[PDB]
Design a protein around this nucleic acid. Sequence first.
RNA 1: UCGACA
DNA 2: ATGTCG
Length: 136
Amino acid sequence: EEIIWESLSVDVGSQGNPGIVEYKGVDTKTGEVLFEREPIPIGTNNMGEFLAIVHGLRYLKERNSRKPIYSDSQTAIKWVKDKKAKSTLVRNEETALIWKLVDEAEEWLNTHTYETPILKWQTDKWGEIKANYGRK
RNA sequence: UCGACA
DNA sequence: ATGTCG
Ligand code: VO4
Ligand SMILES: [Mg+2]
Ligand SMILES: [Mg+2]
C-alpha cells in the first residue's frame, strides 16, 4: 500500500501524559498547517489523538472534501469508529476542559454523517506522520 | 504472560 | 514513566 498524498494528517502533541495536550492537522503533501488546537492544560495522549481526528472530520466536511484522514493512533481510530472515546482519565474539576471537548467531539460524531476514510499512518514504513510534534 | 499502537 | 487495544 502506498501513501495517499491527497489527504489530511493529524497528530497530538503533549508535555507529560497526562499533561498539556495540543494537536494539529496538516496537508499530508505539503505540511501546511490547516488547524491547530490551543494547548489544553490537562489531558491524555489518546484523548488528544481522538480530538484531532474529529476536528479533521469537521474541517473536511465543512469544505465538502472527500479526502481521507491519516492518524498514527490505533486507539483514536477505534474510538472514532465506535463514536465513543473510552478514556480512563479521571473526571474531576482538573480535567474539565479536556473532557468537555471530548464529550462535544463525541456529540458531533453522533449528530453528523461522513464517509471520510480514517486511515492508519504506517509509521514503521513511512516514518513520522507529517503532523507530528514529539521526538523521533 | 505478553504483544501492539501511541 | 503513562495512555489504551488485541
Ligand atoms: O459547523 V457544524 O459542522 O457544528 O454543523
Ligand atoms: Mg500520534
Ligand atoms: Mg506524534
